[PDB]
Structures are given as C-alpha cells and as structure tokens.
Design a protein around this ligand. Structure first.
Ligand SMILES: [Ca+2]
Ligand SMILES: [Ca+2]
Ligand SMILES: [Ca+2]
Ligand SMILES: [Ca+2]
Ligand SMILES: [Ca+2]
Ligand SMILES: [Ca+2]
Ligand SMILES: [Cl-]
Ligand SMILES: [Cl-]
Ligand SMILES: [Cl-]
Lengths: 140, 56, 140, 56, 56, 140
C-alpha cells in the first residue's frame, strides 16, 4: 500500500535542520485526506515549524494542510484534507509530504517515530493500507 | 455534522472538528458522536473532508 | 439527603463491563441539575463511553446529559442540567443515573472514586445535601 | 451570562460554560466571573441550567 | 487578523487570540501565522492591541 | 527601562495575602500593552485571584486587563492591552499593576518568579526594554 517515510538527517547542535516526510506508493485514485501523530523528544529537538511539501498542489496550501506542535505532550500532528470539493487537490504523486524544521539542542539521537494514524483515504473515500518508517535527527 | 450541537451546521463546527483531529482541543462525549460524520467509531481527517465538502 | 453510588462489578481482563452510577434518596422536588468528577486508573480501566440511565427522561437525552473522559488527567466528568425550561425533565425517581462502559486492561483493582462535586440542585434551585460511595471494577 | 465578553449572550456562551464545567476548557479570570451566573463563587451545573433557561 | 481562517475578521478571532496569549488554548501552526498580526515571529499583547483596534 | 517588581510579603499559614506587582520606570509615552508569565508553587500557595492595580485607569478594567491561573502548569499569566483605541487607557504612572491574592498553604518559601515576557510596548507601538525582580510570600 502506501509507505510514509520519516526522513533521516544529520546536523550539528545549534543548527536548524529539515526532516522530510515522504509519501511512497501513492495509489492511482490518489490521497484526498490523511492524519497522523509523530512522537519526539523536546529536550533533543526543538521543532519550530512544519511546512507542506511539493506533492500538496493546493494554491492556498493552508486550506488543505495544517499541523500542530506540542512540546509538553512530546508529539506533532498532521492534518491533510484536500479543499477543492472535487478531489482536484488530492496528492497524486510520490515525494515530500511535509518538512519538519527542528533546531538541534543536544548530541543525543533525535528520534521522530510514528505514534498514531487516523484517516488515510483516496478520492473514492476508501481507506488505504498504510505503513510507517521511523526516522529523525542523528539517529544513524 | 453539528459538532457543538447548537442546531446549525456552519464553519464553527468544522473549526472545532479540525482542532480536535489536530489534538488542540478535546470534544465532549456527546460532541464526539456528532463529530463522527461517517460513523465509523473514530474522529479523523475523513470526517474533516466530508464536513468541509458539505459546507462548500 | 441524596446518595450517589458508584457501582461495584467484576469482570475478566479483555472484556468490556458496565459500571452503574446510582442516585438514591431523590427528593420530592427532584433533581434539575448536577455535576461531579470521578477519579480512575487508566492503566487498569479503559473507559470508552458513558451513557445516561433510565432516570433521565429527556426524549433527547444529549440536550440534558453530557460527559467527558480524560485518561491523561485520570478523571471522568458528568454534567446534567434538564433542558425543558420548566423542570419537566428533572430526575424524580431513584435508579441508574449513568452507565460507565470500561474495558478491563489488568487484574489489579479498578477503583472509581468520588473526586469533586459542583452543583446539585432541585427544581426550586435549592442545593441538596449529597454523599458519595466509591466503587469500580474488581475492587472487592 | 456573557461568558466570552463580546457584548451578546448567545449559544456560544452556553457552549463555553458547559465545556468549562465538563473540564474540556479553562476560562480566563474575567470570564470566570461572568460565567458565575448565580454569583456563588463556583462555576457549575446550576449556572448551566440558569443560562440555558435564559436563552430559551 | 483572521485567526481561525473562516474568511471573516470578527470578535471570535480576538477571543481566540487573547485566550492564546493567556495560554488557555493552543493555536494550530496555520492559525499561529494569521494570529501574528505585526508579523514579528511572536504571538503576544501587541497583536491583541492591533486586532482589537482594527475591530473598533 | 521599565522594571517589573514582584512584591515580597509575609503571612501565616491559612491566611490570604496580597502580592503586589509594581511597574517602575514607566516611560513618557506610557504602556499601551503588556503580557508576561510568572511561575509559582501550587503546593505552597493557592492563588485564588488576580486584580488590576490603580495604574490601570480603564473604567471597565476587564476590557483592558485579563489574567489566568494554572495550578497544574504552576504558572500565572497577565494580559494588558488598553481598550480605548486611542491610547487613552494606557499606563502612564508608576505603581501597582496587579494584586495577586494567594492563600498560604505551607510554611515553605512561596516563590513567585519571572518566567516569560511577550509584548511590552508604548503608545507608539515601540517595544520597551524591561527587567523583572522576583518575589513572593515568606521568601525573605
Ligand atoms: Ca453547530
Ligand atoms: Ca469517523
Ligand atoms: Ca457572548
Ligand atoms: Ca455559580
Ligand atoms: Ca475569522
Ligand atoms: Ca506578533
Ligand atoms: Cl475551538
Ligand atoms: Cl469552547
Ligand atoms: Cl477559544
């Protein structure tokens, strides 16, 4: 089915790095909506923002794509639901779904791991099979 | 669709639903049932898509 | 005055059980509104829902009765306020106020205990004397 | 009755009050005083009943 | 100014912004950018003042 | 620049005391808006309310001044933004900005310390330099 890949990057303490979230194996009907939660360590990584990738084609991306960061709860949340009304702004190709901007606070491994998945449906509102690969910063 | 249960389905319901999925807020047990648009036992992005399309 | 009884039930691990909340000694003027908080252990019991009992007579019970479950805060909250406008949907007889649906996660005692009470008034908006008996699952 | 303090008493106030009693949200210190309908120093189901009756 | 992003700037936006600064609620990442009225990278009382003046 | 002074008071266990928050060195243009967070120990002090001081001149003080108390998060938050629209309700003189009402729960030092500051601007919307002095109850 669909494979969601949390990227693996390296960076120095005090620098801000970008951790890509990849969508692999996007079906022919596409992906009209999805939501999922990732876990992280706020003592290791300070996540300052999340941006939509190029596979989100909505000219007003905030209408279809939104996120939230909770350091006290040690989680980040993604919400995608294409806002065309017709299925026009659905994800149809593989690539970067989102980019996590994080400032490295310590040399320890900064794991960004899959926690929970909600909906993940195509344009026919059929829920797709999905699997997650964990990643993060300095985890190799 | 009527998340808050005030008798009208509008933008306020979608905002509450989207914030709930993004885990910014919690919904009460009554509101949870009404937020479950497709009635599959979970409140997620599929409900968000359906409600947003209903309003549009 | 009024006695609120948290029921005591037994059940196997992996099964979903129902824990009744009883209202005893309901006054002649009835009970137009009430709110209270119960404490529980989320590691022992997974509370998946709370339903109104038969002593709530509102044909649209959600208008008069609402609840909330907070595993991270280890509490459940009840809110009753009869929605007729005249006192018609007030509780007038003894019996089951609410039913707590919980899935047993472990063999340890699953205490459901009284934490806090707010309002508890009759149809004349007079606050009634109220006492609570603790219960739960496998607590005997 | 005017929980949020926007100048109008409507369904939005009751929703905020009910969610506050159900402990879904917290009210600010100013809002707490306005949510205390019967002015007895506590925000509870008695305030909920009174506000809902006022709107009905 | 449009905190919730419903297309209209009204009292609901100011209430959300004020509650955010008072730390009663959290805003989503999209809402955070729109709540940043003076666009200085922070959401605070200066944004509150500017939005309240805009509505008045 | 501007100095914010958290007052230092003494009191017996079981009594409610008032901890003043002073604004010193108020500029000539005044203070149109400010927000900041203070930290405290809920086991030592039970903060039951915060009132605006006499340097807030708004005849409807709640329009310009609001606060919040979070025992579970061990913080209190202040929000001031003058509501005249013209700069008329700005703070123009030194004195008591706010009064923290707290009931002393234990004999241990009750520190009320500066945690975070947001905006702090004059009538020309220029952000002012500001410093904080920590205080509390029985901290001497
Ligand atoms: Ca509604
Ligand atoms: Ca659903
Ligand atoms: Ca209002
Ligand atoms: Ca009250
Ligand atoms: Ca808006
Ligand atoms: Ca700003
Ligand atoms: Cl909301
Ligand atoms: Cl709310
Ligand atoms: Cl809000």
């Amino acid at each position: 089915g669909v494979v969601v890949e949390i990227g693996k990057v390296t960076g120095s303490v005090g620098t801000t790095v970008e951790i890509p979230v990849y969508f692999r194996g996007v079906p022919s009907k596409g992906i009209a909506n999805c939501d999922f939660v990732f876990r992280y360590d706020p003592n290791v990584l300070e996540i300052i923002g999340i941006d939509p990738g190029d596979i989100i084609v909505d000219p007003n991306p905030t209408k279809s794509f939104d996120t939230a960061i909770y350091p006290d709860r040690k989680i980040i949340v993604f919400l995608f639901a294409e806002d065309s009304g017709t299925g026009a702004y659905a994800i149809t190709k593989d690539g970067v779904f989102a980019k996590i901007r994080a400032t490295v606070k310590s040399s320890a491994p900064g794991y960004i791991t899959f926690d929970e998945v909600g909906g993940f449906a195509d344009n026919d509102l059929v829920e797709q099979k999905v699997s997650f690969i964990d990643g993060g910063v300095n985890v190799g | 669709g009527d998340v808050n249960g005030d008798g009208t389905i509008n933008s306020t319901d979608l905002t509450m639903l989207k914030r709930s999925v993004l885990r910014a807020i919690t919904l009460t047990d009554d509101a949870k049932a009404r937020a479950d648009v497709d009635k599959n036992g979970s409140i997620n992005s599929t409900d968000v898509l359906l409600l947003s399309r209903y309003l549009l």
